[PDB]
mmCIF file of C-alpha atoms and ligand atoms in Angstrom:
data_model
loop_
_atom_site.group_PDB
_atom_site.id
_atom_site.type_symbol
_atom_site.label_atom_id
_atom_site.label_comp_id
_atom_site.label_asym_id
_atom_site.label_seq_id
_atom_site.Cartn_x
_atom_site.Cartn_y
_atom_site.Cartn_z
ATOM 1 C CA UNK N 1 24.721 -31.781 17.532
ATOM 2 C CA UNK N 2 24.220 -27.618 17.600
ATOM 3 C CA UNK N 3 22.280 -28.060 14.179
ATOM 4 C CA UNK N 4 19.845 -30.500 15.726
ATOM 5 C CA UNK N 5 18.812 -28.756 18.402
ATOM 6 C CA UNK N 6 18.359 -25.810 16.186
ATOM 7 C CA UNK N 7 15.837 -27.481 13.545
ATOM 8 C CA UNK N 8 13.613 -28.460 17.024
ATOM 9 C CA UNK N 9 13.629 -24.994 18.461
ATOM 10 C CA UNK N 10 10.870 -23.878 16.841
ATOM 11 C CA UNK N 11 12.428 -21.210 15.220
ATOM 12 C CA UNK N 12 13.956 -21.909 11.640
ATOM 13 C CA UNK N 13 11.261 -20.012 10.063
ATOM 14 C CA UNK N 14 11.374 -16.495 8.793
ATOM 15 C CA UNK N 15 12.276 -14.126 11.890
ATOM 16 C CA UNK N 16 9.738 -10.754 12.740
ATOM 17 C CA UNK N 17 11.487 -7.954 14.425
ATOM 18 C CA UNK N 18 9.822 -7.220 18.348
ATOM 19 C CA UNK N 19 8.090 -5.538 18.981
ATOM 20 C CA UNK M 1 42.569 3.405 -3.178
ATOM 21 C CA UNK M 2 42.190 5.628 0.561
ATOM 22 C CA UNK M 3 42.514 9.350 -1.200
ATOM 23 C CA UNK M 4 38.852 7.752 -3.438
ATOM 24 C CA UNK M 5 37.053 6.339 -1.130
ATOM 25 C CA UNK M 6 37.191 9.361 1.097
ATOM 26 C CA UNK M 7 36.781 11.645 -1.851
ATOM 27 C CA UNK M 8 34.089 9.367 -2.548
ATOM 28 C CA UNK M 9 32.389 9.436 0.908
ATOM 29 C CA UNK M 10 32.737 13.118 1.069
ATOM 30 C CA UNK M 11 29.894 14.284 -2.564
ATOM 31 C CA UNK M 12 28.474 11.278 -1.372
ATOM 32 C CA UNK M 13 27.180 13.414 2.383
ATOM 33 C CA UNK M 14 26.903 16.139 -0.127
ATOM 34 C CA UNK M 15 23.998 14.794 -2.009
ATOM 35 C CA UNK M 16 22.861 12.532 1.107
ATOM 36 C CA UNK M 17 21.779 15.650 3.165
ATOM 37 C CA UNK M 18 20.137 18.136 -0.108
ATOM 38 C CA UNK M 19 17.447 15.111 -0.323
ATOM 39 C CA UNK M 20 17.304 14.861 3.360
ATOM 40 C CA UNK M 21 16.911 17.897 4.069
ATOM 41 C CA UNK M 22 14.491 18.454 1.420
ATOM 42 C CA UNK M 23 12.549 15.530 0.350
ATOM 43 C CA UNK M 24 11.155 14.264 -2.406
ATOM 44 C CA UNK M 25 7.037 13.933 -2.732
ATOM 45 C CA UNK M 26 4.163 12.584 -4.575
ATOM 46 C CA UNK M 27 6.263 10.968 -7.454
ATOM 47 C CA UNK M 28 3.602 8.907 -8.606
ATOM 48 C CA UNK M 29 -0.342 7.768 -8.657
ATOM 49 C CA UNK M 30 -1.810 4.409 -8.091
ATOM 50 C CA UNK M 31 -3.886 3.786 -11.319
ATOM 51 C CA UNK M 32 -0.322 4.034 -13.027
ATOM 52 C CA UNK M 33 0.512 0.143 -12.145
ATOM 53 C CA UNK M 34 -0.461 -2.999 -12.715
ATOM 54 C CA UNK M 35 -0.119 -5.030 -9.182
ATOM 55 C CA UNK M 36 1.022 -8.705 -10.097
ATOM 56 C CA UNK M 37 1.504 -10.316 -7.450
ATOM 57 C CA UNK M 38 2.213 -10.504 -3.277
ATOM 58 C CA UNK M 39 6.406 -11.045 -2.295
ATOM 59 C CA UNK M 40 5.470 -10.802 1.374
ATOM 60 C CA UNK M 41 3.370 -9.744 4.017
ATOM 61 C CA UNK M 42 2.375 -9.787 7.294
ATOM 62 C CA UNK M 43 3.221 -6.482 9.969
ATOM 63 C CA UNK M 44 5.135 -4.652 7.771
ATOM 64 C CA UNK M 45 1.696 -4.763 5.388
ATOM 65 C CA UNK M 46 2.194 -5.931 1.403
ATOM 66 C CA UNK M 47 4.762 -6.009 -0.998
ATOM 67 C CA UNK M 48 3.244 -6.333 -3.674
ATOM 68 C CA UNK M 49 5.134 -7.267 -7.445
ATOM 69 C CA UNK M 50 3.905 -4.147 -9.961
ATOM 70 C CA UNK M 51 3.993 -3.531 -13.621
ATOM 71 C CA UNK M 52 4.417 0.531 -14.962
ATOM 72 C CA UNK M 53 1.631 0.427 -17.422
ATOM 73 C CA UNK M 54 3.447 2.213 -19.709
ATOM 74 C CA UNK M 55 7.732 1.561 -19.813
ATOM 75 C CA UNK M 56 6.880 -2.262 -18.323
ATOM 76 C CA UNK M 57 9.183 -1.841 -16.141
ATOM 77 C CA UNK M 58 8.519 -4.102 -12.952
ATOM 78 C CA UNK M 59 9.017 -2.344 -9.399
ATOM 79 C CA UNK M 60 8.392 -3.832 -5.783
ATOM 80 C CA UNK M 61 5.336 -1.869 -3.752
ATOM 81 C CA UNK M 62 5.839 -1.682 -0.432
ATOM 82 C CA UNK M 63 1.978 -1.002 0.675
ATOM 83 C CA UNK M 64 0.988 0.307 4.001
ATOM 84 C CA UNK M 65 -2.556 1.283 5.728
ATOM 85 C CA UNK M 66 -2.499 3.974 7.274
ATOM 86 C CA UNK M 67 -4.402 3.451 9.917
ATOM 87 C CA UNK M 68 -2.711 0.133 10.437
ATOM 88 C CA UNK M 69 0.561 2.551 11.173
ATOM 89 C CA UNK M 70 -0.609 4.531 13.974
ATOM 90 C CA UNK M 71 -2.039 0.636 15.962
ATOM 91 C CA UNK M 72 1.278 -0.210 15.893
ATOM 92 C CA UNK M 73 2.320 3.140 17.165
ATOM 93 C CA UNK M 74 4.680 3.252 13.663
ATOM 94 C CA UNK M 75 4.274 6.518 12.611
ATOM 95 C CA UNK M 76 7.819 7.807 12.655
ATOM 96 C CA UNK M 77 9.693 4.670 11.645
ATOM 97 C CA UNK M 78 7.638 4.858 8.792
ATOM 98 C CA UNK M 79 7.990 8.009 7.694
ATOM 99 C CA UNK M 80 11.280 7.933 8.888
ATOM 100 C CA UNK M 81 12.101 4.949 6.398
ATOM 101 C CA UNK M 82 11.153 6.313 3.611
ATOM 102 C CA UNK M 83 12.434 10.253 4.115
ATOM 103 C CA UNK M 84 15.854 7.275 3.598
ATOM 104 C CA UNK M 85 15.296 5.366 1.089
ATOM 105 C CA UNK M 86 14.665 8.619 -1.165
ATOM 106 C CA UNK M 87 17.999 10.561 0.167
ATOM 107 C CA UNK M 88 20.083 7.507 0.189
ATOM 108 C CA UNK M 89 22.282 6.128 -3.234
ATOM 109 C CA UNK M 90 24.408 3.142 -3.500
ATOM 110 C CA UNK M 91 24.822 -0.482 -4.834
ATOM 111 C CA UNK M 92 23.376 -2.444 -2.675
ATOM 112 C CA UNK M 93 21.036 -0.225 -1.184
ATOM 113 C CA UNK M 94 17.150 -0.879 -3.248
ATOM 114 C CA UNK M 95 16.433 2.322 -4.289
ATOM 115 C CA UNK M 96 13.178 3.933 -3.802
ATOM 116 C CA UNK M 97 11.556 4.614 -7.831
ATOM 117 C CA UNK M 98 8.376 5.857 -6.255
ATOM 118 C CA UNK M 99 6.455 7.135 -3.767
ATOM 119 C CA UNK M 100 2.903 8.315 -2.837
ATOM 120 C CA UNK M 101 -0.324 8.660 -0.809
ATOM 121 C CA UNK M 102 -4.049 8.393 -1.439
ATOM 122 C CA UNK M 103 -6.810 8.576 1.792
ATOM 123 C CA UNK M 104 -6.150 4.926 3.283
ATOM 124 C CA UNK M 105 -2.296 4.365 2.128
ATOM 125 C CA UNK M 106 0.795 5.079 2.119
ATOM 126 C CA UNK M 107 3.891 3.311 -1.208
ATOM 127 C CA UNK M 108 6.759 2.844 -1.164
ATOM 128 C CA UNK M 109 8.172 1.766 -5.139
ATOM 129 C CA UNK M 110 11.436 0.145 -5.432
ATOM 130 C CA UNK M 111 13.555 -1.655 -6.606
ATOM 131 C CA UNK M 112 12.702 -5.447 -7.525
ATOM 132 C CA UNK M 113 14.653 -7.903 -6.787
ATOM 133 C CA UNK M 114 13.974 -10.984 -8.542
ATOM 134 C CA UNK M 115 16.397 -13.562 -7.556
ATOM 135 C CA UNK M 116 15.026 -14.035 -4.151
ATOM 136 C CA UNK M 117 14.950 -13.513 0.006
ATOM 137 C CA UNK M 118 18.586 -14.759 1.396
ATOM 138 C CA UNK M 119 16.978 -16.634 3.940
ATOM 139 C CA UNK M 120 14.814 -19.080 1.447
ATOM 140 C CA UNK M 121 18.593 -19.510 -0.412
ATOM 141 C CA UNK M 122 20.171 -20.008 2.837
ATOM 142 C CA UNK M 123 18.024 -22.716 4.234
ATOM 143 C CA UNK M 124 17.034 -24.456 0.778
ATOM 144 C CA UNK M 125 21.482 -25.221 0.760
ATOM 145 C CA UNK M 126 21.845 -24.999 4.032
ATOM 146 C CA UNK M 127 24.939 -23.080 4.978
ATOM 147 C CA UNK M 128 27.249 -20.976 2.038
ATOM 148 C CA UNK M 129 30.485 -22.510 1.954
ATOM 149 C CA UNK M 130 33.644 -19.234 3.162
ATOM 150 C CA UNK M 131 33.802 -18.181 -0.438
ATOM 151 C CA UNK M 132 29.322 -17.241 -0.804
ATOM 152 C CA UNK M 133 29.305 -16.041 2.070
ATOM 153 C CA UNK M 134 32.527 -13.463 2.013
ATOM 154 C CA UNK M 135 31.072 -12.746 -1.205
ATOM 155 C CA UNK M 136 27.992 -10.923 0.381
ATOM 156 C CA UNK M 137 29.687 -10.381 3.843
ATOM 157 C CA UNK M 138 31.541 -7.730 1.477
ATOM 158 C CA UNK M 139 28.949 -5.659 0.312
ATOM 159 C CA UNK M 140 27.460 -5.082 3.933
ATOM 160 C CA UNK M 141 30.941 -4.183 5.326
ATOM 161 C CA UNK M 142 30.339 -1.540 2.459
ATOM 162 C CA UNK M 143 27.061 -0.727 2.587
ATOM 163 C CA UNK M 144 27.764 0.016 6.501
ATOM 164 C CA UNK M 145 30.169 2.527 5.575
ATOM 165 C CA UNK M 146 28.634 3.990 3.638
ATOM 166 C CA UNK M 147 25.138 4.270 6.235
ATOM 167 C CA UNK M 148 27.565 4.881 9.115
ATOM 168 C CA UNK M 149 29.593 7.749 7.558
ATOM 169 C CA UNK M 150 25.824 9.732 6.943
ATOM 170 C CA UNK M 151 25.502 9.263 10.664
ATOM 171 C CA UNK M 152 22.624 6.105 9.859
ATOM 172 C CA UNK M 153 22.569 3.181 11.811
ATOM 173 C CA UNK M 154 20.607 -0.128 10.393
ATOM 174 C CA UNK M 155 19.394 -3.063 13.427
ATOM 175 C CA UNK M 156 17.900 -4.987 11.640
ATOM 176 C CA UNK M 157 20.377 -7.101 9.724
ATOM 177 C CA UNK M 158 19.264 -10.429 8.992
ATOM 178 C CA UNK M 159 19.481 -13.060 6.242
ATOM 179 C CA UNK M 160 15.386 -12.354 5.832
ATOM 180 C CA UNK M 161 15.751 -8.671 4.764
ATOM 181 C CA UNK M 162 18.760 -9.546 2.736
ATOM 182 C CA UNK M 163 17.144 -9.569 -1.507
ATOM 183 C CA UNK M 164 19.488 -11.061 -4.028
ATOM 184 C CA UNK M 165 19.213 -9.086 -8.290
ATOM 185 C CA UNK M 166 19.677 -10.679 -11.128
ATOM 186 C CA UNK M 167 23.413 -10.799 -10.944
ATOM 187 C CA UNK M 168 23.967 -11.777 -7.958
ATOM 188 C CA UNK M 169 24.913 -9.232 -5.724
ATOM 189 C CA UNK M 170 22.713 -7.868 -2.911
ATOM 190 C CA UNK M 171 19.755 -5.842 -2.077
ATOM 191 C CA UNK M 172 19.112 -4.204 1.473
ATOM 192 C CA UNK M 173 15.669 -3.705 2.393
ATOM 193 C CA UNK M 174 13.837 -2.421 5.449
ATOM 194 C CA UNK M 175 14.842 0.343 7.030
ATOM 195 C CA UNK M 176 12.301 0.931 9.337
ATOM 196 C CA UNK M 177 14.167 0.655 11.848
ATOM 197 C CA UNK M 178 17.411 2.901 11.040
ATOM 198 C CA UNK M 179 17.879 6.003 12.883
ATOM 199 C CA UNK M 180 20.223 9.112 11.946
ATOM 200 C CA UNK M 181 22.583 9.937 14.904
ATOM 201 C CA UNK M 182 25.518 10.444 15.958
ATOM 202 C CA UNK M 183 26.375 9.196 19.792
ATOM 203 C CA UNK M 184 24.379 7.117 20.932
ATOM 204 C CA UNK M 185 20.370 5.945 20.695
ATOM 205 C CA UNK M 186 18.848 3.506 23.568
ATOM 206 C CA UNK M 187 15.043 2.149 21.541
ATOM 207 C CA UNK M 188 14.914 -2.255 21.836
ATOM 208 C CA UNK M 189 14.158 -2.424 18.674
ATOM 209 C CA UNK M 190 15.410 -4.995 15.689
ATOM 210 C CA UNK M 191 14.855 -9.162 15.667
ATOM 211 C CA UNK M 192 16.468 -11.207 18.749
ATOM 212 C CA UNK M 193 19.142 -13.477 17.595
ATOM 213 C CA UNK M 194 20.494 -10.125 15.754
ATOM 214 C CA UNK M 195 20.927 -8.207 19.321
ATOM 215 C CA UNK M 196 24.165 -7.080 20.398
ATOM 216 C CA UNK M 197 24.628 -7.601 24.026
ATOM 217 C CA UNK M 198 24.400 -3.570 24.717
ATOM 218 C CA UNK M 199 21.166 -3.381 22.604
ATOM 219 C CA UNK M 200 18.963 -5.876 25.168
ATOM 220 C CA UNK M 201 21.022 -4.264 28.500
ATOM 221 C CA UNK M 202 20.031 -0.722 29.415
ATOM 222 C CA UNK M 203 22.618 1.011 28.738
ATOM 223 C CA UNK M 204 22.637 3.651 25.187
ATOM 224 C CA UNK M 205 24.335 2.004 22.392
ATOM 225 C CA UNK M 206 25.666 3.343 18.869
ATOM 226 C CA UNK M 207 26.617 1.729 15.168
ATOM 227 C CA UNK M 208 28.986 -0.547 16.956
ATOM 228 C CA UNK M 209 25.238 -2.742 16.920
ATOM 229 C CA UNK M 210 25.130 -2.767 13.226
ATOM 230 C CA UNK M 211 28.959 -4.602 13.105
ATOM 231 C CA UNK M 212 27.855 -6.788 15.593
ATOM 232 C CA UNK M 213 24.747 -7.815 13.771
ATOM 233 C CA UNK M 214 27.422 -8.135 11.195
ATOM 234 C CA UNK M 215 28.683 -11.206 13.166
ATOM 235 C CA UNK M 216 25.674 -12.894 13.708
ATOM 236 C CA UNK M 217 24.888 -12.689 9.752
ATOM 237 C CA UNK M 218 28.586 -14.581 8.792
ATOM 238 C CA UNK M 219 28.382 -16.750 11.452
ATOM 239 C CA UNK M 220 24.309 -17.660 10.319
ATOM 240 C CA UNK M 221 25.657 -17.415 6.184
ATOM 241 C CA UNK M 222 28.328 -20.386 6.641
ATOM 242 C CA UNK M 223 26.705 -22.122 9.774
ATOM 243 C CA UNK M 224 23.121 -22.569 8.962
ATOM 244 C CA UNK M 225 22.299 -22.033 11.790
ATOM 245 C CA UNK M 226 22.192 -18.090 14.131
ATOM 246 C CA UNK M 227 25.324 -18.777 16.762
ATOM 247 C CA UNK M 228 22.352 -17.992 19.477
ATOM 248 C CA UNK M 229 19.430 -19.010 19.565
ATOM 249 C CA UNK M 230 16.100 -21.413 21.450
ATOM 250 C CA UNK M 231 13.261 -21.365 22.040
ATOM 251 C CA UNK M 232 11.926 -17.915 23.447
ATOM 252 C CA UNK M 233 13.428 -14.701 22.588
ATOM 253 C CA UNK M 234 14.430 -13.735 26.801
ATOM 254 C CA UNK M 235 16.468 -17.284 26.434
ATOM 255 C CA UNK M 236 18.263 -15.887 23.626
ATOM 256 C CA UNK M 237 19.174 -12.992 25.122
ATOM 257 C CA UNK M 238 20.288 -14.693 27.999
ATOM 258 C CA UNK M 239 22.633 -17.333 25.221
ATOM 259 C CA UNK M 240 23.810 -13.602 23.604
ATOM 260 C CA UNK M 241 24.846 -11.354 27.078
ATOM 261 C CA UNK M 242 26.784 -14.212 28.377
ATOM 262 C CA UNK M 243 28.179 -13.855 24.941
ATOM 263 C CA UNK M 244 29.654 -17.989 25.460
ATOM 264 C CA UNK M 245 30.222 -19.115 21.289
ATOM 265 C CA UNK M 246 30.820 -22.131 20.059
ATOM 266 C CA UNK M 247 31.321 -21.986 16.615
ATOM 267 C CA UNK M 248 31.636 -25.132 14.081
ATOM 268 C CA UNK M 249 35.078 -27.552 13.431
ATOM 269 C CA UNK M 250 34.240 -27.138 9.846
ATOM 270 C CA UNK M 251 34.938 -23.062 10.372
ATOM 271 C CA UNK M 252 38.501 -21.671 9.200
ATOM 272 C CA UNK M 253 40.797 -20.377 11.691
ATOM 273 C CA UNK M 254 39.949 -17.220 10.117
ATOM 274 C CA UNK M 255 36.224 -16.862 9.901
ATOM 275 C CA UNK M 256 36.660 -17.595 13.324
ATOM 276 C CA UNK M 257 39.261 -15.696 14.353
ATOM 277 C CA UNK M 258 37.033 -11.947 12.760
ATOM 278 C CA UNK M 259 33.775 -13.555 14.098
ATOM 279 C CA UNK M 260 34.914 -13.172 17.681
ATOM 280 C CA UNK M 261 36.263 -9.890 17.482
ATOM 281 C CA UNK M 262 33.076 -8.825 14.834
ATOM 282 C CA UNK M 263 31.409 -11.212 18.631
ATOM 283 C CA UNK M 264 32.653 -9.184 21.499
ATOM 284 C CA UNK M 265 30.637 -8.276 24.399
ATOM 285 C CA UNK M 266 34.149 -5.573 25.094
ATOM 286 C CA UNK M 267 33.530 -1.629 22.759
ATOM 287 C CA UNK M 268 36.547 -0.893 23.418
ATOM 288 C CA UNK M 269 37.717 -4.398 21.570
ATOM 289 C CA UNK M 270 34.880 -4.406 18.395
ATOM 290 C CA UNK M 271 36.163 -4.803 15.198
ATOM 291 C CA UNK M 272 34.285 -1.499 13.635
ATOM 292 C CA UNK M 273 34.199 0.276 17.015
ATOM 293 C CA UNK M 274 38.576 0.965 17.177
ATOM 294 C CA UNK M 275 39.870 3.592 15.557
ATOM 295 C CA UNK M 276 41.272 1.968 12.563
ATOM 296 C CA UNK M 277 37.532 1.834 12.304
ATOM 297 C CA UNK M 278 35.744 -0.420 9.210
ATOM 298 C CA UNK M 279 39.651 -1.026 7.732
ATOM 299 C CA UNK M 280 40.571 -3.130 10.564
ATOM 300 C CA UNK M 281 37.603 -5.449 9.107
ATOM 301 C CA UNK M 282 38.113 -4.530 5.383
ATOM 302 C CA UNK M 283 41.908 -5.477 6.260
ATOM 303 C CA UNK M 284 40.943 -8.839 8.093
ATOM 304 C CA UNK M 285 43.059 -12.239 6.747
ATOM 305 C CA UNK M 286 39.452 -13.671 5.791
ATOM 306 C CA UNK M 287 39.262 -11.143 3.759
ATOM 307 C CA UNK M 288 42.572 -11.282 2.251
ATOM 308 C CA UNK M 289 41.182 -12.537 -0.854
ATOM 309 C CA UNK M 290 38.252 -9.427 -1.698
ATOM 310 C CA UNK M 291 38.500 -6.453 -3.976
ATOM 311 C CA UNK M 292 36.574 -3.975 -2.812
ATOM 312 C CA UNK M 293 36.792 -1.177 -5.612
ATOM 313 C CA UNK M 294 35.566 -4.610 -7.641
ATOM 314 C CA UNK M 295 32.962 -5.673 -5.730
ATOM 315 C CA UNK M 296 32.010 -1.925 -5.040
ATOM 316 C CA UNK M 297 31.831 -1.805 -8.811
ATOM 317 C CA UNK M 298 30.217 -5.759 -9.011
ATOM 318 C CA UNK M 299 32.471 -7.031 -10.895
ATOM 319 C CA UNK M 300 32.565 -9.413 -9.275
ATOM 320 C CA UNK M 301 32.030 -12.644 -10.420
ATOM 321 C CA UNK M 302 29.023 -13.888 -7.926
ATOM 322 C CA UNK M 303 29.399 -17.231 -6.936
ATOM 323 C CA UNK M 304 25.302 -17.836 -7.331
ATOM 324 C CA UNK M 305 23.696 -16.960 -9.240
ATOM 325 C CA UNK M 306 19.889 -17.362 -8.597
ATOM 326 C CA UNK M 307 17.648 -18.487 -11.509
ATOM 327 C CA UNK M 308 15.515 -15.727 -13.609
ATOM 328 C CA UNK M 309 12.634 -16.777 -16.243
ATOM 329 C CA UNK M 310 11.475 -13.262 -16.326
ATOM 330 C CA UNK M 311 11.796 -9.825 -14.872
ATOM 331 C CA UNK M 312 8.092 -10.367 -13.551
ATOM 332 C CA UNK M 313 8.343 -14.158 -12.315
ATOM 333 C CA UNK M 314 8.031 -14.951 -8.481
ATOM 334 C CA UNK M 315 9.218 -18.299 -8.687
ATOM 335 C CA UNK M 316 11.933 -17.931 -5.753
ATOM 336 C CA UNK M 317 8.910 -16.108 -3.511
ATOM 337 C CA UNK M 318 6.731 -17.918 -1.438
ATOM 338 C CA UNK M 319 2.511 -18.303 -2.393
ATOM 339 C CA UNK M 320 0.352 -15.449 -0.385
ATOM 340 C CA UNK M 321 -3.543 -15.242 -0.578
ATOM 341 C CA UNK M 322 -4.382 -12.074 -2.888
ATOM 342 C CA UNK M 323 -6.501 -8.978 -1.046
ATOM 343 C CA UNK M 324 -8.280 -6.042 -2.891
ATOM 344 C CA UNK M 325 -6.154 -2.648 -1.904
ATOM 345 C CA UNK M 326 -9.259 -1.250 -0.690
ATOM 346 C CA UNK M 327 -8.575 3.388 -1.095
ATOM 347 C CA UNK M 328 -11.640 4.547 1.684
ATOM 348 C CA UNK M 329 -13.683 7.240 -0.104
ATOM 349 C CA UNK M 330 -12.482 9.680 3.146
ATOM 350 C CA UNK M 331 -8.968 11.235 4.348
ATOM 351 C CA UNK M 332 -7.695 9.104 6.845
ATOM 352 C CA UNK M 333 -4.669 10.666 9.031
ATOM 353 C CA UNK M 334 -3.809 13.503 7.003
ATOM 354 C CA UNK M 335 -1.908 15.318 9.383
ATOM 355 C CA UNK M 336 -0.228 12.448 10.542
ATOM 356 C CA UNK M 337 1.226 11.406 7.270
ATOM 357 C CA UNK M 338 1.653 14.855 6.501
ATOM 358 C CA UNK M 339 5.151 14.233 5.670
ATOM 359 C CA UNK M 340 5.070 11.246 3.779
HETATM 360 C C1 LIG D 1 9.848 -10.405 -0.082
HETATM 361 C C2 LIG D 1 10.040 -10.575 1.578
HETATM 362 C C3 LIG D 1 11.431 -9.909 1.315
HETATM 363 C C4 LIG D 1 11.757 -9.792 2.750
HETATM 364 C C5 LIG D 1 10.874 -9.577 3.886
HETATM 365 C C6 LIG D 1 11.044 -9.381 4.915
HETATM 366 C C7 LIG D 1 11.557 -7.693 6.291
HETATM 367 N N1 LIG D 1 11.544 -6.725 6.901
HETATM 368 C C8 LIG D 1 9.578 -6.977 5.606
HETATM 369 N N2 LIG D 1 10.014 -5.624 5.348
HETATM 370 C C9 LIG D 1 9.503 -5.178 3.918
HETATM 371 N N3 LIG D 1 10.061 -4.436 3.691
HETATM 372 N N4 LIG D 1 10.542 -3.388 1.997
HETATM 373 C C10 LIG D 1 10.649 -4.179 1.728
HETATM 374 C C11 LIG D 1 11.169 -4.826 0.137
HETATM 375 C C12 LIG D 1 11.734 -3.742 -0.588
HETATM 376 C C13 LIG D 1 12.251 -3.281 -1.902
HETATM 377 C C14 LIG D 1 11.905 -4.781 -2.625
HETATM 378 N N5 LIG D 1 12.315 -5.275 -4.056
HETATM 379 N N6 LIG D 1 12.214 -6.384 -3.753
HETATM 380 C C15 LIG D 1 11.696 -7.332 -2.940
HETATM 381 C C16 LIG D 1 11.687 -8.687 -3.225
HETATM 382 C C17 LIG D 1 11.709 -6.036 -1.574
HETATM 383 C C18 LIG D 1 11.255 -5.995 -0.658
HETATM 384 S S1 LIG D 1 9.926 -6.397 2.561
HETATM 385 C C19 LIG D 1 9.071 -10.138 3.717
HETATM 386 C C20 LIG D 1 9.247 -10.796 2.092
#
């Protein structure tokens, strides 16, 4: 499911702005 | 209630330009504050919880290392964030209480939000109920109506920048990517998951990008995850530009309709960027139960009130290693930051 994919995306933590 | 709003923004613009043209400087000194604990760290330097030694009032003090800001090529960005913070005044915008600098650093002492980062709360609960998400969205909508009237574009909306106060209301933080501009601009900045198509693409853009970001926020708040995500940013940009969006089945029909108008690749149709402006948003069915004036007045009961043990309590934040605030015997980058 979409949720499962998110949980395994590596981007569930705090996201920095692009530099 | 429309006459009042127009009258409200009129006075607001008057108060903003006076301060914008004549910014406040050196309104305090470091030794007036006792450092208590670090609330957050990273590129932006560090934000510490501090206590005014005489009043006993607690604040969130953002400390920036000048040499570091120069290395990161963020000189103008930092000067601008401070110039903006000292000139604006809105219920949902974090307040700048004091600002000063010494040989090594720059300091921005702002109002402390005990409730924690919205990010933390969202990942903790999973997702917010549509009524809960709406309560927050409303505050953002008004905040953008305010900022946009001053020709200020935010450009970094995300759960990570929204703090929760004692009454459960929002305090928008970090204006290091904000800019005062009438018309278009082209800088690639912001956070990947929240970038509008026109930011990713080379063409210039306008304030409409904040409304797209609002769409991403509402979606994440109600789903628990963003509408466009992947392992790497370049993959995320791909999805964003295609603009294909899927909604969780638990999303109400009207929420999906609102999102379809916000996460709209075509500017000629994106709500917030049409002839009726923000009103298309405030008058949308999903917001039918929203009492806009009452929200502005902070009279509405927050659907979620974070726990709070005291004004100096930090249990709603993560733990960070403490580091001595060192001040070099020599003045660094005086010319570069003369305006701070
Ligand atoms: C803890 C934390 C919150 C948000 C972040 C992500 C940000 N992009 C970092 N930049 C920032 N600038 N101003 C920030 C700020 C200003 C006034 C404040 N009052 N109360 C609190 C809490 C608070 C935070 S935070 C990181 C750590």
